[PDB]
Design a protein around this ligand. Structure first.
Ligand SMILES: Nc1ncnc2c1ncn2[C@@H]1O[C@H](COP(=O)(O)OP(=O)(O)OP(O)(O)=S)[C@@H](O)[C@H]1O
Ligand SMILES: Nc1ncnc2c1ncn2[C@@H]1O[C@H](COP(=O)(O)OP(=O)(O)OP(O)(O)=S)[C@@H](O)[C@H]1O
Ligand SMILES: Nc1ncnc2c1ncn2[C@@H]1O[C@H](COP(=O)(O)OP(=O)(O)OP(O)(O)=S)[C@@H](O)[C@H]1O
Ligand SMILES: Nc1ncnc2c1ncn2[C@@H]1O[C@H](COP(=O)(O)OP(=O)(O)OP(O)(O)=S)[C@@H](O)[C@H]1O
Lengths: 333, 333, 333, 333
DNA sequence: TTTTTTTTTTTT
């Protein structure tokens, strides 16, 4: 009743008839050669921290993918996301933070650089409405970056009504693994960054390596393209009120799984309290090891205003004058 | 059959249709711009102790979050909570202590300043009725500050009936990590202070730094917004019974994680036995280093009643005459 | 009205009348003797990794079968499939990758050895067009190897439109166990490799053995003929820029079910970041155990450039000169 | 006008007039007394595996019946069927394997003992031609054993042309329950073994016992006469490559429904990779329990070559000398 | 007629 034994005989007619037949129902761009598929070239969007951009390898987060960040107690996993929101918003793109922990005070965020009139914030109770407000945003609109914070706090609906301390086994993962399969396949058709910053909790029963995993389930880690781990709680004291007080936290960002460039190229980053991640104070250490500034215990030798050995080393004049940044940024590139 | 490949084209109609579609099911205030979301301005409520209030930076506990306090054996973690109840109760707000240790002697508590006929005390046995009596209080009522003390002693139900020495691995954190997910997402819809004070316990296997952690688990610290640590057990002997006897403990309050202002600005506080925290003796040290009250070993030089060098330094007239505090509290801002 | 008692009396007329009866309606090769049927001889295509071809026993994936690969987080289950695409594309055969995770960046792919203008990529949304685009490809054309990435990401149609977190019991397996029954019987009339690389998620309720299974359902395993599990996360630091940084990952491929050779004959494999599976540095270890290269901690003594004890051991001369490989591959046979 | 009310009065002429009337249109071999019907004495054909031949009780599969076997992933449900094919082919019998998964590689099967130019294989697509090619073979010829593997792969005709994932409820069962009623009533007229090996898939919604059933439908079991469940996946390491490597699989065969002997009489069996089921290694565990070989941890004491405690215990001499088996297999009666 | 997914530390 049908065609006979399909012996392997590569007739280009016998492939082009099928490559005409499977487009009468599914459009013109549902099967094509990759060398004419120019959309799969990973467009890159930067992050301000040149340490993190030279750490990622390709120079920023890949577009159309999912990145997740997690680190321990008060290590600025919110601040890197806020800096990325300001970075993606600066070059003409609309973003929409949504919150879970009810954590983003706007007066803190306004000092970093993110605007306030262009942040479509939300306050969901459950994850059932906490994720469709991202779904209908992405799959309809043309936003460029939308984050959801603290994915241990997307509480499912079936125990926002019940009692306390009962059996709800896997009832977080059975929402997260399903909403990821619904959401994160319709992102590459839009090429929009989506970040889910995470938590840390511990297991029981270990003889090897890691005692610290993430909640939400294993399904989040497989779909995520670039993972970031942010650790480090040592402190630095500056010349705050010309004396010794705490003015700087110092963390460390290591990239553990990446799909565009080799991972485990960790970076080193400093941050002051309130003024966000200091990009100019970041610039000095990464220009020191390339020796475009000469590192010495008495006199930083090279250009831009005869530094010395204070604390506001370069920041006393290149925060005063712009347009010295682009001769250094592409130069260290 | 649906909308086709969603090309990135920033049409404000193509976002405004979504910003009409996602409000027919979740009301009018489920997504809006932050520049018109004036409710996220952090309402600040002070706490009487001017050293703690200048120590936080913002000037009080941020209204609508969770704060936690812990310190070692008998250092007054209860007294700062009681003083916060009195401060939130002074300006027209119903408060509700509940106990776990069965430790609040009311005759002590009446002398600090909190009333007794406006305090919804309870006696929960386990955590099962221990936090539903907080949940149905917060998520229904309009209270302004509730506390639940000693979260090491919210014993779970599954071993309030069994023998002693039974394997119950994780059965405190497996209650707390779900109880906080039930509570601390529905606090910001009422903007109500909730405090959980804590005990300190040690670990085994140490090569770096801290040998003292907290029980309850890692889920409590992440959702907590402002932490406070209370240490210090030196004593002071005053003119008690005209004699060198014990009248005063002296503790040191440090802020280790904050979300509204830079942390690690610790204060210095005194406390007398029975009279609660002493704000007047707290006032002299913080007025000394700004020299509104002049520091001298023979004669405290400035205004209000010609101090001298006794022990009741300023307290012998400002406890007897009011309207001298308004020229001091806003003046030291 | 019909034939009488069919007593067993083996007349070859009484079977040859049936073997001329049942072929006038169903062609000539619907039933024949197996010893005159040379088509059941399992034609084997290699995979480049000599550890894998000495591991599989018969020297590669057998044609006309379905293989699957699964491993934990970021262990190169994509990379072995890419190397198989390169091996099937090298000796004159058209291949067609398709994606589900929207994962394969082409700039990474062009480095391993796969061509770009001879790859029929696709971007399906649902599993509906996810598998019929494989069915119409195999059952019509004459492709030689076609893979499908991440069969846990082939979401069915009936909940690509529904809400989040609803009753959708078995709706992945109820597509997979039917589409496999429609697909995987028409492969052996064409003898074409089909690879379905997979995921890993856990169960609940365990007493014995395995807590890590696969999604998709039980039907994917049973029709699969050759299974591969790829584990391992140790690292090796090479002489990257005369610095000890990360340039080498190391996995461990084990074969757990086979139908052409005994199972459990696991293999060892290294991988560098970007150059794919390094077959050259892999060749030295499998030549060590047969001692055609003399393994010594000071001087690799045998032929081909008189190696020594560096890091680029053999690749410093056989990546510069060819035809030393065919006197080695059939030599280690 | 007809015969009157049939009063019960057992006259032998009143029975013999009916028992001559009802045979001139239905033949003589349609009704007879049981005590002379020598066909219903169940002729038994053995199975090679002596533990299975003591497990069935009657010493093999009863002829004229339909037996079926099923077990989970890779427990050798193909191998027991191939061994039964070789056992029926050994004593003068022509057999006809047919395949559904297109799974029997001939080079594996040639090692077990089944001849290759005497196996009428077929390659069906649908179940429509998949079962009539067995029907016309059984009902016409005088074949002695014929199997059809994997009855979850006999896909019906009505969706071999349709799309993927449509409403086809019970479309497998309405083929199977009808073709079994057409086929398996004409087996007692020929006394031919027919085996249908099976799969295992899981039900949803349970409160008692078994969560695992078989596909194909319910009407397979009612017509089946002997069922067998084949589980067990633990391994044994022998002296392969004078090394403890994987050379041995060990399963467990139970009989759960039988119509000639009581059920639940399971057996134990071993299988090596490539050489099939080992009958000599099967003989030792069944000869130890009747102490024809004495079980001792240091010296297997009894006859046949003064065994000792190696791994090939009996295989060092009865692999080369025959006719010591005939004084054993009848001896263990 | 077919599975889907983990969760939490305790103490010298
Ligand atoms: N706007 C701000 N003003 C002052 N200090 C801040 C501000 N934001 C953050 N910090 C502090 O600086 C650090 C950076 O913040 P985060 O890394 O986000 O803290 P955290 O450990 O992530 O806890 P979360 O996730 O914010 S609840 C922390 O130590 C904060 O206490
Ligand atoms: N009402 C009171 N009258 C007299 N002494 C008091 C009173 N309340 C507290 N104290 C003492 O003053 C100090 C302050 O109390 P706390 O810091 O609460 O003691 P503690 O170490 O916290 O133990 P807990 O948690 O209160 S049971 C302690 O040294 C108490 O012994
Ligand atoms: N083209 C590439 N460039 C740089 N690093 C790569 C590239 N491909 C893979 N890697 C890395 O090398 C390893 C091999 O990749 P994979 O095994 O495919 O990762 P994975 O664990 O399988 O996750 P998936 O399935 O690819 S999303 C991983 O650690 C990747 O981060
Ligand atoms: N000819 C062979 N050569 C090597 N190994 C074999 C061969 N036949 C079977 N095996 C292996 O030995 C075991 C017995 O085979 P089977 O019982 O057929 O496996 P299975 O679980 O039944 O899967 P199926 O039914 O064959 S698809 C399995 O673990 C096979 O991997």
């Amino acid at each position: 009743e049908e065609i006979s034994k399909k012996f392997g005989a590569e007739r280009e007619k016998a492939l082009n008839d099928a490559l005409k037949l499977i487009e009468k129902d599914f459009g013109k761009g549902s099967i094509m050669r990759l060398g004419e598929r120019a959309e799969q070239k990973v467009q890159v969007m930067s992050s301000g921290s040149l340490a993190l951009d030279i750490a990622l390898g390709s120079g920023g987060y890949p577009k159309g993918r999912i990145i997740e960040i997690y680190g321990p107690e008060s290590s600025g996993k919110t601040t890197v996301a806020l800096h990325a929101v300001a970075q993606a918003q600066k070059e003409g793109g609309i973003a929409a933070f949504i919150d879970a922990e009810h954590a983003l005070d706007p007066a803190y965020a306004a000092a970093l650089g993110v605007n306030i009139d262009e942040l479509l914030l939300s306050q969901p109770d459950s994850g059932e409405q906490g994720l469709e407000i991202a779904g209908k945003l992405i799959d309809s609109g043309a936003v460029d970056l939308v984050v959801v914070d603290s994915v241990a706090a997307l509480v499912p609906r079936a125990e926002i009504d019940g009692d306390i301390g009962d059996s709800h086994v896997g009832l977080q993962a059975r929402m997260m693994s399903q909403a990821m399969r619904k959401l994160g396949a319709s992102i590459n058709k839009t090429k929009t960054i989506a970040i889910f910053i995470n938590q840390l909790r511990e297991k029981v029963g270990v003889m090897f390596g890691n005692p610290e995993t993430t909640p939400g389930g294993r399904a989040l880690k497989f779909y995520a393209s670039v993972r970031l781990d942010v650790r480090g709680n040592t402190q630095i004291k500056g010349t705050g009120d010309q004396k010794e007080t705490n003015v700087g936290k110092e963390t460390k960002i290591k990239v553990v799984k990446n799909k565009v460039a080799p991972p485990f190229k960790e970076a080193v980053v400093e941050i002051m309290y309130g003024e966000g991640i200091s990009k100019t104070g970041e610039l000095l250490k990464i220009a020191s090891d390339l020796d475009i500034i000469k590192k010495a215990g008495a006199w930083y030798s090279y250009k831009d205003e005869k530094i010395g050995q204070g604390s506001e080393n370069a920041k006393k004049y290149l925060a005063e004058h712009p347009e010295i940044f682009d001769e250094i940024d592409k130069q260290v590139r």
